[PDB]
Amino acid sequence: MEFKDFPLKPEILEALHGRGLTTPTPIEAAALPLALEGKDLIGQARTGTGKTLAFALPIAERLAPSQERGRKPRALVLTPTRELALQVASELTAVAPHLKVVAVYGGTGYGKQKEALLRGADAVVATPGRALDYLRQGVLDLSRVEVAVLDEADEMLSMGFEEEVEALLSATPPSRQTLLFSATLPSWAKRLAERYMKNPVLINVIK
Template structure:
């Protein structure tokens, strides 16, 4: 008997707090197999509402367990009713998030024969068309590719019983509102709709009023607030010294998983090159990468092959990697909401995490806006051994010129010639 079969046998006797939801036994077995013992706050509040068939508006960040909050009720509905396929549609802003949702829902459906399929851009149509021909029960999709399949006649949405919009604020930020409206026009009016978002700007609130009918509202933490267990630290630094300070901070934290955010694709590539030259195991993630390259970067980061992942905001949306201890903002984001999304990649599922921001003089206004949004100031910090007085080179290059640019760095102190010590677990 294999180890997995042994575990299957063992969990038959396991009783978890998920039994309170009266889920199908096959779902309870899967939940126990995955090691879930008790629901997270959003699961505890959202699952009963979703099981009752009500529309739902959930205010929750990534890492709170919201995939199970809508995934388990959807599976329960499919298992206990007789519906034409597809029964449920889950919309995601990015292909990475779509893949992660598909993977999670498949795990919940481990002991069933239900079919779950993700369709997204950046890859060929062939395998997705084959999957659609088999009649999936649940479809996870990015809006653009979904509409491509609909326009080709490969998929019809008139059987959808449950519609989920995950990370709705990100979806609208990325310009998907017209596509979302086209999709909504194609699904039945009589349906259950669930909308999840970390922040609620005016566009999201307007959309929620249009598509939700007498919804229940589930709020985990303050809407738009940063995750609990997260420490916020700002490091004021001249723009031309950001590359060296980033390097020193990575030496200091000695973490197995650090996510570094930049504003541009060019900057992400230049920082990756710089850190690679300093012997860090690093990958970059941005929209110019092919789907294969993006998945390789993510998989390498998840598996510990890369200790540092440098990403832009759009490419990083939907990243769901456990164990990220630090998020470093090489550049401050354009909005406080983006700061919440960036830093929400750490301190997940009640863990601790650190959000570090390198703040050039011309970013102080942005920093104050973020602090007002958070409702508190950030700790200002400085590295004792770091020389902040090194003058800028006469002709600034693309790495050091301003806080908005990145290029080859000037070595300013001997410590930057050390080989990085990561991976090494960081004590808290």
């Protein structure tokens, strides 16, 4: 199946077509049907093999545009690094032209990201430390999140973000969809699935 064969808005299909993207990776092809109907998934795939569209397309398809100044984000993607936050935010911005995506990360000051959040956001792609700082400031409000993504859960564990990831998910409605991507499934990741996910389907394309 090409992206064309899935039930995606014409505007999302136009965005993919323009960027030369026609064929899902295996993990994407298997994930899309479940993710597009709002189901929780664990995706186990290696390295930097392609998996961003397994969550970016569902976010794009699920969220209608909003004009409201000051609005809270309806999607949250957590990433282990600034590098990945910027890369994922760029990919999500491209397949979701109708959504305001804001990347949140440390290693820089607080002002610009604060100013972007106060203006309003639809999706936030964040590293966990900075995201938690903003939640504590009451600047990041997660109460309207409908889709939470953990991108490279095992890497977030190895960096020591376990507590921050848990706190952030705890600040989102449990009625949300949760998607967890990790090449390995350490005990902490299994605890997350149990505590923070709803009957997750596991898709493993490691081989």
